[PDB]
Design a protein around this ligand. Structure first.
Ligand SMILES: [K+]
Ligand SMILES: [K+]
Ligand SMILES: [K+]
Ligand SMILES: [K+]
Ligand SMILES: [K+]
Ligand SMILES: [K+]
Ligand SMILES: [Mg+2]
Ligand SMILES: [Mg+2]
Ligand SMILES: [Mg+2]
Ligand SMILES: [Mg+2]
Ligand SMILES: [Mg+2]
Ligand SMILES: [Mg+2]
Ligand SMILES: [Mg+2]
Ligand SMILES: [Mg+2]
Ligand SMILES: [Mg+2]
Ligand SMILES: [Mg+2]
Ligand SMILES: [Mg+2]
Ligand SMILES: [Mg+2]
Ligand SMILES: [Mg+2]
Ligand SMILES: [Mg+2]
Ligand SMILES: [Mg+2]
Ligand SMILES: [Mg+2]
Ligand SMILES: [Mg+2]
Ligand SMILES: [Mg+2]
Ligand SMILES: [Mg+2]
Lengths: 121, 306, 173, 113
RNA sequence: GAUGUUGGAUCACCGCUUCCUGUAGCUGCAAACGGUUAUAAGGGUUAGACUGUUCGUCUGAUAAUGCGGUACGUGAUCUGAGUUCAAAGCGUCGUAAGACAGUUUGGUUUCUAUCUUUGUUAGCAUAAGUAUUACGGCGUUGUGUACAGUACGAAAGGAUUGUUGCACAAUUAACCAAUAGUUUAAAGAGCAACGUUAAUAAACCGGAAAACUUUUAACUGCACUGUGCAGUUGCAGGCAAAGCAAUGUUCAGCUAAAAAAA
RNA sequence: AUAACAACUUCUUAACUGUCUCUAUUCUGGAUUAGGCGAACUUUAAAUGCUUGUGCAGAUGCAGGCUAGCUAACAAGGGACGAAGAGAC
RNA sequence: AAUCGUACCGCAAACCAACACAGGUUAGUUAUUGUAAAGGCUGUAUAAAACCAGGAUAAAGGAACUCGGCAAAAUAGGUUAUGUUUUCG
């Protein structure tokens, strides 16, 4: 449950460190969570691939708000993080230091499921 | 209330006898019909009777797929046919059902008189259900039990909601209010404007204002019947039911279901004939996969790549 | 019966803050033990009846832990000594209901309701209370029912020292 | 409620664990074609409320940080629970400080199976 | 012998000269995307940077971000940034007192509701219950995706149709088993949404009343400013080894009971 | 031009937060219920509905179309060109 | 060695404010490490509306509020190697 204009930490190796949400896509409501794609602005980057002041797409991977499952259980993280994506829908890096959850078992996240180190499933 | 009574006058002697003869002729009725309890075919336009139940509370269970299901428990103490209506006397056909039990010295003589006259217990609540044909009438005294319903169907529930007292616009109608700071003065939770100026010059009817909230009749449609316990007269329904514990709830076959669905269920008609004691506890089976979205793309995704 | 509210414990607010509320009820409870009959307003009487019953329960306990709790409630040493010695023996067999409340109309000035709170077994009692242990007829359905449900039903008052304690003392001496 | 609790006890037999114990929990992931995994973590909260009982499991990873799960105790997805160790704490305030500051909670780095 | 100014906050009723969601023709209409005319006002009409603003420029999304009337709606409901008192500075004009119709900083926002209008509730007035029909209120929403790379088309591009299927959003109606927040004379309490369930309709809700039925024509009360679906083996008090508004129970209060024998 | 100084006006950074997305629960006092005590603004006369038309040109009171149990309590503030001060412009 | 003051109130219900008025009113003395000797004073009867005032707590986000960070919150305190500006303090 992240409202618009929230700050996120980048967990890929593309070079970006800090981003801010500036928009949503479709009709998600007043807040977004894990598995949704948003529009972000880069605030702090140290690299050649990306620079501060650019606008990119990203996917939410971790959040501190409870994530509910059909069986009645839920889990929480201790940080909010995202992964930058290209216009074709592929990550801008090749190594993700994050814990992948059940949301990414879906077919559309095959690339993320390959470059991630630790997986909960 | 009622309007003041209208004046009455004696009839002239040349007309009084004629009026009385005609009024008596219209008020003369034939013998009461005697319904017979027998299975009947179900037709495209044929409504069944409902039942009167008591709300017990909420619980939860896990289904065959391991999913948590919230449930509301309804208890049917004793529901019986306590009267009939027919065209000759009332102009339409209906069945009257009563439920509950009260002591004789706690009700008015008018209420107790009807039940004593037919050798029936004094019942706390009474409600009417309209039928389509005279053959749909049930004999007086027939019991309506939990076996009246088929597990897995959809039902409608009606009742009175929980009383909340005198409440403001923010809680009663969800008004936004006014800012907590920036110079606001004693108007944080007030409704604000209620009209304009000289035109139109008045406040419209049903304008939303503070008042009492919480004791009103509400209906929920399309709830699922999860489990049935004919022996103990229990119904387990998924979802929320209006009213607090002990509220009186009316249960009916949902109008959202089509004729084909009713035929497939093979609902009892006019009602279940037999002894419900020797019946097992049944749970509905759902031929659906709640985890299909993890194998196939069926979910909502607004972005088109490339 | 005494109404139950939504605050912690379900007690009355007595139109006072919690700190002043506790100071008042402790003082009145001390006076009830000393005099055994008090006339006051209905709200203070209802709260005192329920609070008074729980203070007698501590006295019946006769333990070090119970005395510590009671020592923070009673205001006078003489009243605390009476509670553990005299009232403890008086209500050995009575299971609850050690205090009664009877309404007595309205006052003169502010027309407030009033009532009388009293102990239920003593000389000077307003009425005669039922025996602490109810006698059971020898040929009644009640006697058979109690045997089937509670074989340890008590039908007559028990002595201060039960036979097991008496037998031990006799064997020792 | 008691009727359902009796049936559950006939099907499963779990130990009487407390807060502060390290547990190994075997669970089935319905999302991943009902595959079995084993999780190890610390028990930080336990609620005894009959059929609605639940507990919280805490663990820390090498780089991703802390991770918390809330698990109903009577959920059929859970297959087994075992006690493997104990972590000392002084009071709730001390336990909360430990959770916020991830350290010395990396029993197993990943999930088994 | 006084009809409170601009813009906004809050909450509204109406018109159609229709921005989107509809229906039917024409086209310089292959498909897709369009153009134009007739008809249609049920629902919807976005979050931010600059500016006191209306307006205007721009950014990310959106099915789309329409116009107008209502004292250019709305201060006995709120706001006071601009404008429009007394202080002061600068520029220009006047010998001066001073002026600006230029600019800059600062500068008090009252009212206990008698009548009418409106939301709720009680008492009184023709006994109570069930109540067809009539009357009044409410308004049946939107996006993506699958059926299909199929019809059409050289290629590229790329559909129509549905009482369609599925997922989601807003609105409305409730709900408290679970999850999150909240009270120390504490808690498996109560109330709550950040949580759960349901709806896309001749469905749903309100009051009067024909007829019918019953009665010796009915009429307070459980501490009662939460609820009584609790009226005498009745009870949210007390007491117990008990899940603590539940189970058990000999005590408290309201309201004490019986012919003998055969 | 200028170091220091400023409850002066302007813009920015760090942190913080119910200012806000979006509110919820709760304590104390008032309101609200009961007994006692006991004011004030105001008042031509009143038994004081809606709508369109009319008119010293924006009608509770005039004309047409409608409106039928009775008196109040608690609550809101559209109208009575509402009250206060013989308009300051 | 005569003469005048000596009662009572005096941070206040007795003095100045039309009042038993949340305002105004001079000097001298007293207990107290984290506390505090003497002395002095004291509130009609209840509670589980809306709304208003003064407090407390709050998931995820953290100025997106607004004319304006108004109000509220916030490790706020001390010692520093080095650097900058000075009218050299
Ligand atoms: K209306
Ligand atoms: K329910
Ligand atoms: K006790
Ligand atoms: K249109
Ligand atoms: K200054
Ligand atoms: K008014
Ligand atoms: Mg608000
Ligand atoms: Mg003011
Ligand atoms: Mg305020
Ligand atoms: Mg038109
Ligand atoms: Mg307008
Ligand atoms: Mg205007
Ligand atoms: Mg106004
Ligand atoms: Mg001047
Ligand atoms: Mg000058
Ligand atoms: Mg000059
Ligand atoms: Mg100032
Ligand atoms: Mg509840
Ligand atoms: Mg009790
Ligand atoms: Mg009061
Ligand atoms: Mg007119
Ligand atoms: Mg008129
Ligand atoms: Mg004049
Ligand atoms: Mg917070
Ligand atoms: Mg802003």
């Amino acid at each position: 449950m992240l409202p618009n204009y929230s700050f996120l930490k980048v967990v890929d190796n593309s070079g970006a460190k800090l981003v801010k949400i500036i928009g949503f896509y479709g009709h998600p409501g007043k807040a977004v969570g894990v598995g949704e794609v948003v529009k972000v602005a880069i605030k702090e980057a140290k690299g050649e691939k990306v620079s501060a002041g650019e606008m990119k797409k990203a996917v939410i991977v971790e959040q501190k708000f409870p994530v509910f499952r059909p069986n009645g259980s839920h889990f929480r993280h201790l940080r909010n993080s995202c992964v930058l994506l290209s216009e074709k829908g592929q990550p801008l890096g090749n190594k993700v230091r994050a814990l992948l959850t059940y949301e990414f078992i879906k077919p559309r996240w095959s690339k993320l499921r390959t470059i991630t180190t630790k997986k909960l499933f | 209330g009622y309007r003041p009574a209208k004046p009455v006058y004696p009839l002239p002697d040349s007309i009084a006898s004629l009026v009385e003869d005609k009024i008596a002729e219209l008020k003369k009725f034939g013998p009461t019909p005697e319904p017979a309890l027998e299975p009947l075919p179900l037709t495209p336009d044929s409504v069944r009777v409902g039942c009167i139940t008591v709300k017990a509370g909420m619980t939860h269970e896990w289904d065959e797929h391991g999913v948590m299901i919230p449930l509301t428990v309804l208890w049917i103490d004793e529901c019986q046919v306590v009267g009939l209506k027919y065209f000759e006397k009332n102009g339409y056909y209906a069945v009257q059902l009563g439920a509950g039990c009260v002591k004789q010295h706690t009700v008015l003589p008018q209420i107790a008189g009807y039940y004593l006259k037919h050798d029936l217990p004094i019942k706390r609540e009474m409600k009417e259900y309209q039928v389509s044909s005279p053959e749909a009438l049930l004999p007086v005294g027939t019991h309506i039990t939990a076996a009246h319903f088929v597990v897995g169907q959809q039902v409608d529930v009606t009742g009175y909601t929980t009383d909340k007292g005198f409440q403001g616009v923010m809680k009663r109608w969800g008004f936004k209010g006014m800012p907590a700071s920036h110079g606001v003065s004693l108007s944080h939770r007030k409704p604000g404007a209620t009209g304009g100026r000289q035109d139109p010059g008045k406040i419209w009817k049903e304008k939303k204002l503070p008042g009492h909230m919480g004791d009103e009749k509400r209906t929920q449609l399309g709830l699922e019947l999860y489990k049935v316990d004919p022996k103990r007269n229990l119904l387990y329904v998924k979802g929320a039911v209006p009213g607090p514990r002990g509220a009186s709830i009316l249960v009916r076959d949902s109008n959202r279901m089509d004729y084909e669905e009713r035929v497939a269920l093979n609902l009892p008609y006019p009602t279940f004939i037999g002894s419900p004691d020797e019946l097992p506890v049944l749970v509905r089976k759902s031929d659906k996969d709640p985890y299909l979205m993890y194998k196939k793309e069926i979910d909502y995704f607004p972005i088109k790549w490339k | 019966t005494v109404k139950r509210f939504l605050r912690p414990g379900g007690w009355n607010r007595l139109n006072r803050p919690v700190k002043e509320r506790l100071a008042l009820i402790k003082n009145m409870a001390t006076q009830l033990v000393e005099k055994e009959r008090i006339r006051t307003t209905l709200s203070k009487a209802k709260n005192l009846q329920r609070y008074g019953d729980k203070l007698i329960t501590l006295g019946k306990a006769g333990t070090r832990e119970s005395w510590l709790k009671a020592n923070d409630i009673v205001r006078t040493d003489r009243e605390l000594h009476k509670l553990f010695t005299t009232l403890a023996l008086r209500y050995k067999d009575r299971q609850g209901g050690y205090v009664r409340l009877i309404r007595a109309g309205f006052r003169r000035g502010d027309a407030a309701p009033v009532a009388i709170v009293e102990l239920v077994d003593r000389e000077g009692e307003l009425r005669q209370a039922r025996p602490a242990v109810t006698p059971v007829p020898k040929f009644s359905v009640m006697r058979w029912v109690k045997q089937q449900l509670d074989p340890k039903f008590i039908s007559e008052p028990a002595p201060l020292l039960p036979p097991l304690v008496r037998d031990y003392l006799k064997e020792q001496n | 409620e008691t009727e359902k609790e009796v049936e559950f006890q006939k099907q499963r037999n779990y130990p009487d664990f407390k807060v502060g114990d390290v547990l190994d929990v075997t669970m089935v992931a319905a999302e991943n074609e009902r595959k079995t995994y084993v999780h190890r973590g610390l028990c930080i909260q336990k609620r005894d409320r009959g059929y609605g009982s639940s507990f919280k499991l805490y663990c820390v990873f090498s780089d991703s940080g802390g991770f918390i799960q809330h698990l109903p105790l009577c959920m059929p997805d859970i297959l087994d629970i075992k006690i493997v160790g104990q972590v000392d704490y002084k009071d709730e305030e001390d336990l909360k400080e430990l959770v916020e500051s991830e350290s010395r909670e990396c029993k197993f780095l990943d999930k088994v199976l």
